[model samples]
Target: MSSRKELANAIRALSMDAVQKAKSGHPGAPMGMADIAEVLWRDFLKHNPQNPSWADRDRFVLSNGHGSMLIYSLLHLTGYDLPMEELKNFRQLHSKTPGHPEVGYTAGVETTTGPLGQGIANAVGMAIAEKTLAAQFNRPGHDIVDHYTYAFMGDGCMMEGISHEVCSLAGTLKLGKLIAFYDDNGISIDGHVEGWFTDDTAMRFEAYGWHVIRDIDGHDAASIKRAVEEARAVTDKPSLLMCKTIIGFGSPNKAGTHDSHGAPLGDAEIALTREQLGWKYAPFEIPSEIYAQWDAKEAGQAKESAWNEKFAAYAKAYPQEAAEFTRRMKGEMPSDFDAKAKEFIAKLQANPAKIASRKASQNAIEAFGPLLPEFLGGSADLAPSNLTLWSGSKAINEDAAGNYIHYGVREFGMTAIANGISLHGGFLPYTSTFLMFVEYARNAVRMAALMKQRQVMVYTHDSIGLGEDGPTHQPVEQVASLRVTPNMSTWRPCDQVESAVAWKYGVERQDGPTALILSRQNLAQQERTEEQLANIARGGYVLKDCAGQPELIFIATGSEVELAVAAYEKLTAEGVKARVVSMPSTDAFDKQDAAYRESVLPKAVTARVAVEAGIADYWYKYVGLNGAIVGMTTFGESAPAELLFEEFGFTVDNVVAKAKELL
Candidate 1:
């Protein structure tokens, strides 16, 4: 414990040195919150420095990511994967350590945070993942599923709207194992948060049903540790511990200045700060006694031994559970997992009662309960409406109780958290909300796609067919928006079989995200078999074809596929050969070989008509220069569903007329 003081000193000194060396990055936070992070990492956090992704270990995320040097320095000194040299190369090109703490690049970092409040959402997801795993796996006497999710955020993080969204969900879920340490420094990158952030933060958390503990002194190790223990002891509800601290404690000129928030502290200030800490070592140099002070080797060894003993006992008591435990911990799927779309469709068809394809897709998730175990997550308070429940599933609790998550109304946070869980690896993460709400989560979802993460978003209420919610609730540009995101595939399933196809691709392709855009209104079952549904993995498939070379192509997705089919029949009867292409996914279709693509959309077929119930904007590329799109460019009014459909030109005649005009 004594060594932590010296260890803290080491982190502080190196932090000042790193920024001074790089001549970039903010030293204020790392220098200021030294003791906060030190206490968290050294004492309470059960992480294996050798293996940062250890399943049972508690997570530590620096949501206020500007102070990455602070985290990097501590990781280096504490024997984590981040080397001392890398800390020396802070914010350097091609370094594992970057300016902001990126999740995949750094082992100890739980989430890639830089966007003010996204890390809070990431932590919420981590907390939710822990609770979900515990509920599904940790039966009596098997405590292997337990772990806390902690996030360190600052005034900047609290000020972001996303922080509010995530924290509110954490409270609603009663995320007791989730604790947030707020660096209430009364400062931000823009100086003081007065006019905008003057509200009572602790009181707000209380309103959110979080256990709030406020300590004016940020450097007090005892109180910080105590607050954490108190948070750990709570059976339900999240925790927020706000600690007030000076931004840069020992800097003579920059200590309380706005200058300290960013930019380097000059050499003189670094030297003076080192002197102030009563250390005689040069830059990046620490006394051996400091390492002794923390008893780095002995303490880490002890932590590893304790976790090993617990795991060994867990394995001995339950061999089958242990195997499944290791399986998920290693992020491996079950052996029975194959052609999941087939099983899902079978389950849906077995229900017999006609239901919305979205509901049918959701009912199919129940069969997943027996086969796919690493599957974790739920919808954004839209589970009942979205049919995303675990079905006879328990709710996730601190006491290891549930498989399902009620993410509240935090659509942004739910998606962001799903990304975090996916980034964490060894588990399959998915989140859902209505297709209209995906806009709220657009940024994080795009980033996930850019990073090629296997995070799935089940977006229901796909189109104008949502009916009563009106145009505002209907997703006009969602499918198109999702389709354009890099490495992201958006699927608008027209029937029950395609719903299975969407989930199957998502689970198998662990390299990128998949969006299952489904309809709230019951779409007629396609005559396509399990084989045709499997073609969805390729992005798009020819649902119906002409008897020979077609004069026109009728392309559609979701509910409009029926329109395309109907129009194809009419146009063919009118002395015109026509083909129908059900382009459920544009992203996947773009990836297909040229021969296959050209076969479906032959250059000879000059006349084309694309029908979708939303925006008509990007249909030209698919339909062709002379082709027509039956969609909306204007907003919709509050009207009946059938009327709205007809008004918006989503009828067979619209496509027939469009095809005739194009011809």
Candidate 2:
């Protein structure tokens, strides 16, 4: 067999063998795209197997990630830390090779991808990051941040709605370094996709302003290389190379059918495939010659070494830029960030401004946005309402030199793309939209939580308080939905102080995503002692306290905190010892020590009333079975903000009545 044929067949053999061993997983894509992957990995991909986190390395994403074996096989063959043993244990728990590619769990995996089209959006984000960083850091002689982002997608990705959103944005932004390969295998698990997915794909991408190269033979190495070269030559737009191939390339009977799309080929079929492809090796076996041919360690090391030399000169010539670039790439915060944050928070405390939490979020952005050059902020066509853009922000256009992105109206795509930017490192990505629209981007938000990405979701118009927009725009259960998501820190700050704190926490956190739920209506700022201000980070703190242990506790968040405080004052005057606990971030409060949580919400104080303008069900945990909840039990109506609050039982009178009844 020719060396190229042997190399490509190696991927097919291992993929089928691993799936057969695990009794699960899809092998068709790996088999179908083997030739294309081989040519790309060997000839064009700029990566270091020894250092997968190389800052300027070209990113490779498998958008059709149900076909996980393709990436696993490539990682092992190309000398990424993924071993043959891991491949053998495919689909098993705790193994690096999960059923889908998980970014942090696997060495060479760029982003977590399973749901269709997320990876493509992620690639667009990575391309955006690359372009922006290159524009910011690269001088005439120093091309430090230059790299390409490549993705392999299939029919599933093409059919997903997010693909349209991101691909359109990518083309509009003129991401010339973003190249994607569409595996035109014509088969899905449900059978041939021609019956359903019959859009003229090339024409569709062309309409999106992409440079489309169609009808390339996927199995032809020379054709694939030529297509890649053609794609690289286009410097004004993203490229889409459509490569046609059989689903299970070498399987004699199942090669062109859906039979091999999702399931592993049986032993008998595997034997036939091995014979058909002239693969003489045993299961999970590759010839020493093939291993040598695929090994990229030496080549990768040389490439990185050359980059190191270039960077060393860059550091010497442009010391400050080099240091800043290095710091951002390392994901480190600025040295004076804490001092700046403290000063900003102190100002908020001193001013005691009565403003909408959404405007307060904008104020926080204005204070911190200029300090952190790595801050990449955007809104999904809701900039005016979301208040995400700060004064220092410049819109990101085709040049990609600005700090802000106008992500059009694609919420799901914007969120997933933010995840990509976070994964690429050096950028603190945040997306903004009305809280009601979070449902549109819920899956991507979940993916960010799953991947433990540090993305901030600035959700404004957080509740029925958004009023006039009616039930369609008002968020009733959105905050609860975000809070329920694991690894997501949700903050529904009541006023400007809490808004600043929420923004600070979101910016500082490294492990997970955060949801900054802001109110549409103005909230009266509550006064706080220095001690209380320090304890705000605890997630739950006593905003107003009685002379001693309270007989009743008013638990509130966002705009309802005022109601709680008013009720507390009324009850206190009536000789009712009542405490008001401002629980802005239940997720953060849940992580606090038991002693601290108990101090904030004493178990002895069972006479509790939890008030918020959202779903009442979620408050049941805090305000026990006996405690009353003054929250929205149904969708809100089209009315004035104050009337909606009163109708929803979010008034001080209602809160006082609920507390009186509970007490």
Candidate 3:
């Protein structure tokens, strides 16, 4: 059998060779953490290389994902679909091996990483999903949903503020199955992190309630194995194994230095390192014996086969639960979901209610929460004001059985963790916070969109309408920013029916994330025909219209839609032809066919007015040069919501004047 050192050297060799070939990549992390990875993958991790999508498989995340070669080597060596040729084409265009590990682009990649601490946060989410699913689905005798979530992070991940945010939550939640290996090499891109990152990491984690295993030699496989065993034995808090390692292990000239952290070692230095390490093979070459030692196909298959047997027994014992578990794991909606949603929306249309869009969102959640047992909802310490919690919601604290999470005041951490939960199947995760606070979680939101994960972001108090909280709390350009993000569906609903539709669309969407920007003030419910109500899903529909070609058109969203409707009534009463369009989601509207778009905003009608309590730049696309926009040009001031709305020119008279000016 090949020795542990030999197996680890294979990773180092592959990493250096690939980085040398690419001329642009990080080589230090993979080299330093190779031994720990070998021990984890060979002895502890439970995964089937052939069945990468196995629902209950252990999740492994490289939180310091700039070390992409480490995972690529592991995946290729353990007999996944990634061939050696792909490693040679590392960082090349369209290759599976990108600079960072992306989930959808690469098989066996649990979640996208490389944005520093986000991966660890994502791992926390995975642990949450696993524990919750286990609590919900696993029987006393059959633990079908049981699995550990492991992550490897470096000094950079330690320095990021999100690490503190998420790690604190992970400890508070007591995720016993979450094990992380911190590569304490003390080197970053700018050299030794000792100059900047000087926190007592072990003590910090201990204070956060984590089980800290300090000063483990990362090069020793036995030490890592022991740490893993100890971590598994601790059935309460999450474990952090801080492994002291050289920056570039096995590199004779550059080991323990910052030079090898990012840049590739030269050919002369590589040759000397290979000679010192007793590696006689050429670049990218692994002997048959090493390959045999590393091959996990037989072991992985046997493990999965055992799991299959356990699942079969489980299915026989509980058919209904078995079917539901299978359906959720496969991301399939219930057969009657569409019909149920329609019935719920019909109820909303039958009764007109005036309430804040945030409250409307809560009502929608109250209606759908029971039906979607997989709906895992939370907020960043704003549940009461955001109105995120439904009647059926139970707060998750020390126990993992509850569906709702109190994520505390960690917006970035909460958002990233939600992405991780979404990446892990069988749960639909939604996070809530003030709309202005989305800036804190923007990167995580963008990452969700990039990965095309179905995460729901509920941002309440959407505009200057939030009032006394002032400009600091109000969101002037937040909605416009969300609208411009690629693959992001942003909704600003006017009333209960539209809020229900937004929730329905967000739940049904599988490709990407949705942002529901809700109001703090009450919005008047507009009456709609059955066709108009159904057309709400199309993103934009005429709530009120005039006969034949209207002389002017008013397009509005959220609270502004109510004002436009009032203006439309006044214009019609005065014998002036005008139309009102309730546009809840511009992103969704842009996806409509040109014919449908033309029907809503006919090109012939150049006289147009767009009103939203946000930046005006985004509306210019809909309203031509001849048109006018009623929007905020600057931040809001501290005042009552009503006074702020009136002062900001968001009243019925302003809408009427803007429409008439366009006419």
Candidate 4:
């Protein structure tokens, strides 16, 4: 057998064997990309198998994660923590080698990438992080924060619109260290790719300002290496290497067909492929010499050691900066973060202001962002209305570093890039747009929650209160819609104090994503105390309490809170005891114990009316089936804010009438 043929065939053999064993999964892409992976991992990838979390190591993302066996085989062969048994257990329940690559579940898997085109966007984010970190920490002759971000994508990733979104931005940013390989295998799940995807990819990328190399033989090691070397030489733009490859390289019967794209090769076909590949080893059996060739433990360790040495010199040269860099990498906030947070909250309390919650969010950013350099903020071309950017925040461009990113009108790409930034560590990334636009970014936001990452999604123009823009711009269901996602904290703050408290919780909750839904309409600051400010962290608390036994409870969020308080005042004046609860975060409130929930909304008091400018369906849970809900059951109309509120029965008079009816 040829020297490199064994290495390439090892991947193909294992991939086919695993799929055949599991009787499921796509094996064609793995077989087709094996040669490309062999060349990349064996010769180019800079990673430490002994310590996969090595900083400054190159990042490789499999954008088409359906080919997970390819990465599993490479990980096992390259001496990562993945064992041979994991390869044997491919596609089995709870196995590290799942049908798709999951980031934290498997060693050496940089990012989870099942959804097409998201992985490449993630790679762009990583490249941005790398370049920014290098700019912040690297010094002359001591390049401690330098590495390339690589992703291998397929036809599906190319077809997905997010690829265009992120790749366009990547080109604009001139991410020279971001290199992508397109597996142009000409076969998709349905049939030949030519039937649908016939765009001239080279010209397409060239138009995006990318450095494009077209029609390289993917199976040829020397050609791929040459292409990669040439891509590395490009320092002004991102590079795309389009590689022509077969669907199944060695399957004699199904080598170039769509039939091999997603299903396992039958037993007879596997035997034929094995014979055609000239393999003499058993299933999952890689030869010792091949292992020696593929093993990267020593080389990886040496590379990491060299980085450590360079970092040592860098630390000596810039002692304080080095300490801060180390702290950031460790994901640690500053020591006085709590003090600063308390101070900001107190500042908001001392001088309560009537402003749109979006402006309140901007005020919070101004108060706290300058204290934390790790807070990177951006908007999807809606900063003017979303109110996300603050003083001292500059837009990030290709040649330099900045705290804010002008993300254009790409919502999905912006959120996915934020996910990538959070996964890369050392940065707390936030993105913004109108709440109505979250539908465009739902998948990426769901991915962020699935990964249990810490990110902030700021959405302004939260409800029909953003009138005249009509139903298209107003979000009638988004408030209730986002609450359905697990591990996502949806906070719709009422005023400046609640907005500042929402930011505090968002910055501290490192286990999940936070969505701060704010209003475009100005809101009156409710009377609060030290207790209410501290209780904001608890998610929901009594904002206005009634003396004696309360006959009715009024619960609301966002702008509706002010209306609820006004209704409570009217009811109390009429000798009816009513209490109002300001619930900024429904997800956080749901987490409270039964005792706390009972304390907020007692079970005995069934006469409740939950009000908000959204779909009333979600409020039915808070207010029992018999309880009333004064919310928008339908979309909004084109009118002024006051008229819309009246049209939707959102006034204090309407709220009081609804409560009287409920009682």
Best-performing candidate as measured by TM-score? 2
- Candidate 1 deviant stretches above 4 angstroms: 1-6, 139-142, 222-237, 278-282, 286-298, 339-355, 397-400, 420-427, 450-453, 529-531, 603-606
TM-score for predicted model 4 compared with the true structure: 0.98
Per-residue CA lDDT of model 2 for 1-663, tens digit only, reads 357978999999999999999999998889999999999999999999999989989999999998899999999998989888999899999999999999889899999999999999999999999999998898888888879999999999999999999999999999999999999999887787878889999999999999999999999999999999999999999999999988899999989999888887999999999999999999888777888989999999999999999999999999999999989988899999989998899889989999999999999999998889899999999999999988889888934678899999999999999999999998999999998888999999999999999988999988877778898898888889888999999999989999999999999999999999998889999899999998888999999988887888889998889888888888888899888999999999999999999999988878888988889999998999988999888988999887888787777777888789876
Q: Provide the TM-score for each candidate, comma-separated.
A: 0.91, 0.99, 0.98, 0.98
- Winner on lDDT between 2 and 4 is 2
Rate residue 91 of model 1 by lDDT.
Answer: 83
lDDT of each candidate versus the true structure: 0.77, 0.92, 0.92, 0.89
**On residues 134-153, what C-alpha lDDT tens digit does candidate 4 reach at each position?**
87777777778889999999
Q: Could you give the C-alpha RMSD of every candidate to the true structure, in order shown?
A: 3.1, 1.0, 1.2, 1.3
- Which stretches of model 4 miss by more than 4 angstroms? none
Model 3 spans with C-alpha error above 4 angstroms:
none
Give the per-residue lDDT of model 1 (tens digit) for 189-258. Answer: 6777785689799999999999998874678778777877788898688999888888887787888667
For model 2 the TM-score comes to 0.99
